[PDB]
């Protein structure tokens, strides 16, 4: 991750698909979104010591003036609540949450340490509390609801530093990603990766599927070769690993998994028509037309439906303005700041996993799993059902609404990885114990950032919140809003209108999000990049029509799958939506 490396790649003066590391994406410098190297700081790092030691970690070292909150107790006091008086969000789908995570891991990927690599630096950090690199465990603060031993510690393992053994630069952290929404997280983003995910025993271009197991008749995704898999912890007699996919995710959730082994399947499904259409097309044609395809289909389920959900009308129109034209000025790079504030998502998570059947009907006979009995259990798609009562339950059932009195759900703030772990995780608390790992400056300098106002007092903070007890709590953990961490402070905020973040995260997100399309000279409406004709054909995609083509579900959301969520109410017969037409990729 030292910026210097690969300085020196020329691109080929003519190329026809993307690169698989992104590299070459930019021509006058090639490096611009290319996987395994430095995010970019949209502001300067701050660290206690300046130079890499994160807020929190030395005793009695303030930060802006204010002793510095542990993550555990802000968690404990503003972000817990009572799971029984969740709200569901009566214009988002589950769909929404989880289409959030998948395209997350389209875009970054920050790397830690293994344990299995303490052997190299003592501290195993699953095990031990000992603050010794590179560990940064979470303290536990007196009277926490779960966790009495103030002994004891949360887990956590310090990202791995941008070019280590540098001593003159400030700690940065690394994508391991291609940062540009290109389905890497179908493909991979390393060259030997993205060979091992096809299938290269035929001229098909196809990706490789699971060799001991189908989903009725239908493909899943082959199965990984981990150390530790932390898949074989969860259902111990089955022993089934975690899946292997472009990104080292896809098992975390059996929802995010469905996603995946959806877009495993479109891209099969288009390689064997484009073979049909193109009989001469060799394997490496196919694989890379298919590609693009997907790569296309992500980017307009991504920017037709989702962000503006995400953002609302009056944060889209402010930042993704209509697009125009490529610009090889534009950085396309993940912020840092991105990789904590897109974990809005995390308001959006329902403690259950949700299975219904072929009649849209609870499916017996567990039609709900808690989530803490989900992580990692890719046994439950291969001998539960499959995908199809999943990918109904993400249609069907709603979204949880963030409140500013109902911020995260106990499956993720005390029981997340329990199955896997020592101990349950604390996801709000590691969001925050994160950003002062990363150096992240506070609340208000990214208001500041944003051009909206800097609250200093508590009333000042109560007017930008339109809440003046979520304020006060605020500032009794953290007792200046200049110490408030970017996730903590964005998911307080009210929502937009007809939005699920507030101001100062729709500023953050809708800014990436405008980077990644204006700085892509591979986005789908790039002149050059699909034929008009391509472009007309691509318009009429739509996720509920891939998951008509590619499953055993035959009734689906109503256009906007995100904003659908009650049947059937908002469903129609498969049969009703048009196939993506390929005509237009025959070649005579
Ligand atoms: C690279 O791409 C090729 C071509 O797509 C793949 O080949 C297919 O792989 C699938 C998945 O394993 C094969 O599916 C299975 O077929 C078994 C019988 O095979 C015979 O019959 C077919 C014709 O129907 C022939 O093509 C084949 O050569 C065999 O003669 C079935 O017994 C299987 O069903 C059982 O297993 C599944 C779990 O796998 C259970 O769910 C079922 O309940 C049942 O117990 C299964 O249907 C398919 O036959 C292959 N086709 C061809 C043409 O080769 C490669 O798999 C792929 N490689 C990689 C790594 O992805
Ligand atoms: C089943 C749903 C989800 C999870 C399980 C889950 C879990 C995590 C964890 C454990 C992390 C890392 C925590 C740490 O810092 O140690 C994490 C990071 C990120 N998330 Fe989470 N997540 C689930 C769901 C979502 C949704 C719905 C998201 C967005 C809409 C979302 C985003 C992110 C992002 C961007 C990150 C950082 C990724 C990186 O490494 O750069 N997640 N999530
Ligand atoms: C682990 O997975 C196994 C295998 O699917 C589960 O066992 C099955 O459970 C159902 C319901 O009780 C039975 O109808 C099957 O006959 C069982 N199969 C086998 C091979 O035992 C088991 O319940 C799972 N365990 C946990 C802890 O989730
Ligand atoms: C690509 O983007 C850059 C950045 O906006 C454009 O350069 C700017 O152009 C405007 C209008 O001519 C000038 O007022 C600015 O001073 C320029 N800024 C910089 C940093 O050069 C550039 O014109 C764009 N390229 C195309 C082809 O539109
Ligand atoms: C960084 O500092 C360490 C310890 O002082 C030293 O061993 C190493 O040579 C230094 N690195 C560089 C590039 O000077
Ligand atoms: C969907 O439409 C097809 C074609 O008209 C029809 O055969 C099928 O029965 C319909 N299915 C449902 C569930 O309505
Ligand atoms: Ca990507
Ligand atoms: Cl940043
Ligand atoms: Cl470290
Ligand atoms: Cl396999
Ligand atoms: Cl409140
Ligand atoms: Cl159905």
Same mark, same amino acid.
């Given at each position: 991750?030292?910026?210097?490396?690969?300085?020196?790649?020329?691109?080929?003066?003519?190329?026809?698909?993307?690169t698989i590391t992104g590299m070459?994406?930019?021509?006058?410098?090639?490096?611009?979104?290319?996987?395994?190297?430095?995010?970019?700081?949209?502001?300067?790092?701050?660290?206690?010591?300046?130079?890499?030691?994160?807020?929190?970690?030395?005793?009695?070292?303030?930060?802006?003036?204010?002793?510095?909150?542990?993550?555990?107790?802000?968690?404990?006091?503003?972000?817990?609540?009572?799971?029984?008086?969740?709200?569901?969000?009566?214009?988002?789908?589950?769909?929404?949450?989880?289409?959030?995570?998948?395209?997350?891991?389209?875009?970054?990927?920050?790397?830690?340490?293994?344990?299995?690599?303490?052997?190299?630096?003592?501290?195993?950090?699953?095990?031990?509390?000992?603050?010794?690199?590179?560990?940064?465990?979470?303290?536990?603060?007196?009277?926490?609801?779960?966790?009495?031993?103030?002994?004891?510690?949360?887990?956590?393992?310090?990202?791995?530093?941008?070019?280590?053994?540098?001593?003159?630069?400030?700690?940065?952290?690394?994508?391991?990603?291609?940062?540009?929404?290109?389905?890497?997280?179908?493909?991979?983003?390393?060259?030997?990766?993205?060979?091992?995910?096809?299938?290269?025993?035929?001229?098909?271009?196809?990706?490789?599927?699971?060799?001991?197991?189908?989903?009725?008749?239908?493909?899943?995704?082959?199965?990984?070769?981990?150390?530790?898999?932390?898949?074989?912890?969860?259902?111990?007699?089955?022993?089934?690993?975690?899946?292997?996919?472009?990104?080292?995710?896809?098992?975390?959730?059996?929802?995010?998994?469905?996603?995946?082994?959806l877009l495993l399947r479109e891209?099969?499904?288009?390689?064997?028509?484009?073979?049909?259409?193109?009989?001469?097309?060799?394997?490496?044609?196919?694989?890379?037309?298919?590609?693009?395809?997907?790569?296309?289909?992500?980017?307009?389920?991504?920017?037709?439906?989702?962000?503006?959900?995400?953002?609302?009308?009056?944060?889209?129109?402010?930042?993704?303005?209509?697009?125009?034209?490529?610009?090889?000025?534009?950085?396309?790079?993940?912020?840092?700041?991105?990789?904590?504030?897109?974990?809005?998502?995390?308001?959006?998570?329902?403690?259950?996993?949700?299975?219904?059947? &072929?009649?849209?009907?609870?499916?017996?006979?567990?039609?709900?799993?808690?989530?803490?009995?989900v992580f990692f259990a890719s046994?439950?798609?291969?001998?539960?059902?499959?995908?199809?009562?999943?990918?109904? #339950?993400?249609?069907?059932?709603?979204?949880?609404?963030?409140?500013? &009195?109902?911020?995260?759900?106990?499956?993720?703030?005390?029981?997340?990885?329990?199955?896997?772990?020592?101990?349950?995780?604390?996801?709000?608390?590691?969001?925050?114990?994160?950003?002062?790992?990363?150096?992240?400056?506070?609340?208000?300098?990214?208001?500041?950032?944003?051009?909206?106002?800097?609250?200093?007092?508590?009333?000042?903070?109560?007017?930008?919140?339109?809440?003046?007890?979520?304020?006060?709590?605020?500032?009794?953990?953290?007792?200046?809003?200049?110490?408030?961490?970017?996730?903590?402070?964005?998911?307080?905020?009210?929502?937009?209108?007809?939005?699920?973040?507030?101001?100062?995260?729709?500023?953050?997100?809708?800014?990436?999000?405008?980077?990644?399309?204006? #700085?892509?000279?591979?986005?789908?409406?790039?002149?050059?990049?699909?034929?008009?004709?391509?472009?007309?054909?691509?318009?009429?995609?739509?996720?509920?029509?891939?998951?008509?083509?590619?499953?055993?579900?035959?009734?689906?959301?109503?256009?906007?799958?995100?904003?659908?969520?009650?049947?059937?109410?908002?469903?129609?017969?498969?049969?009703?939506?048009?196939?993506?037409?390929?005509?237009?990729?025959?070649?005579?």
């Open positions: 991750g030292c910026a210097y490396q690969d300085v020196g790649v020329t691109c080929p003066e003519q190329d026809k698909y993307r070459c994406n930019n021509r006058r410098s090639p490096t611009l979104g290319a996987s395994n190297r430095a995010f970019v700081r949209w502001l300067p790092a701050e660290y206690e010591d300046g130079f890499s030691l994160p807020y929190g970690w030395t005793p009695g070292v303030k930060r802006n003036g204010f002793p510095v909150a542990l993550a555990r107790a802000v968690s404990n006091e503003i972000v817990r609540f009572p799971t029984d008086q969740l709200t569901p969000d009566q214009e988002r789908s589950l769909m929404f949450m989880q289409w959030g995570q998948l395209l997350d891991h389209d875009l970054d990927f920050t790397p830690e340490p293994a344990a299995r690599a303490s052997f190299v630096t003592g501290v195993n950090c699953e095990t031990s509390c000992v603050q010794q690199p590179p560990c940064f465990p979470l303290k536990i603060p007196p009277n926490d609801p779960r966790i009495k031993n103030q002994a004891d510690c949360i887990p956590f393992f310090r990202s791995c530093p941008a070019c280590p053994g540098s001593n003159i630069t400030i700690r940065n952290q690394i994508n391991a990603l291609t940062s540009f929404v290109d389905a890497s997280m179908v493909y991979g983003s390393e060259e030997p990766l993205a060979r091992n995910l096809r299938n290269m025993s035929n001229q098909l271009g196809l990706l490789a599927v699971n060799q001991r197991f189908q989903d009725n008749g239908r493909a899943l995704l082959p199965f990984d070769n981990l150390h530790d898999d932390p898949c074989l912890l969860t259902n111990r007699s089955a022993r089934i690993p975690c899946f292997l996919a472009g990104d080292t995710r896809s098992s975390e959730m059996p929802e995010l998994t469905s996603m995946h082994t891209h099969n499904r288009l390689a064997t028509e484009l073979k049909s259409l193109n009989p001469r097309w060799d394997g490496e044609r196919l694989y890379q037309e298919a590609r693009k395809i997907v790569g296309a289909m992500v980017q307009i389920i991504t920017y037709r439906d989702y962000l503006p959900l995400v953002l609302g009308p009056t944060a889209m129109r402010k930042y993704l303005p209509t697009y125009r034209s490529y610009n090889d000025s534009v950085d396309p790079r993940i912020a840092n700041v991105f990789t904590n504030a897109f974990r809005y998502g995390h308001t959006l998570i329902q403690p259950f996993m949700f299975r219904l059947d &072929n009649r849209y009907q609870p499916m017996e006979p567990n039609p709900r799993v808690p989530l803490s009995r046994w439950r798609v291969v001998l539960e059902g499959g995908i199809d009562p999943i990918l109904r #339950g993400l249609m069907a059932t709603p979204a949880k609404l963030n409140r500013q &009195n109902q911020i995260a759900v106990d499956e993720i703030r005390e029981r997340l990885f329990e199955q896997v772990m020592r101990i349950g995780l604390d996801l709000p608390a590691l969001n925050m114990q994160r950003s002062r790992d990363h150096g992240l400056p506070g609340y208000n300098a990214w208001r500041r950032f944003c051009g909206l106002p800097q609250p200093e007092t508590v009333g000042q903070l109560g007017t930008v919140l339109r809440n003046l007890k979520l304020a006060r709590k605020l500032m009794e953990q953290y007792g200046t809003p200049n110490n408030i961490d970017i996730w903590m402070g964005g998911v307080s905020e009210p929502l937009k209108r007809k939005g699920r973040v507030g101001p100062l995260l729709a500023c953050i997100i809708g800014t990436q999000f405008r980077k990644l399309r204006d #700085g892509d000279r591979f986005w789908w409406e790039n002149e050059g990049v699909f034929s008009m004709q391509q472009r007309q054909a691509l318009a009429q995609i739509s996720l509920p029509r891939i998951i008509c083509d590619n499953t055993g579900i035959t009734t689906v959301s109503k256009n906007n799958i995100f904003m659908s969520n009650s049947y059937p109410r908002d469903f129609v017969n498969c049969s009703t939506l048009p196939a993506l037409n390929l005509a237009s990729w025959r070649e005579a």
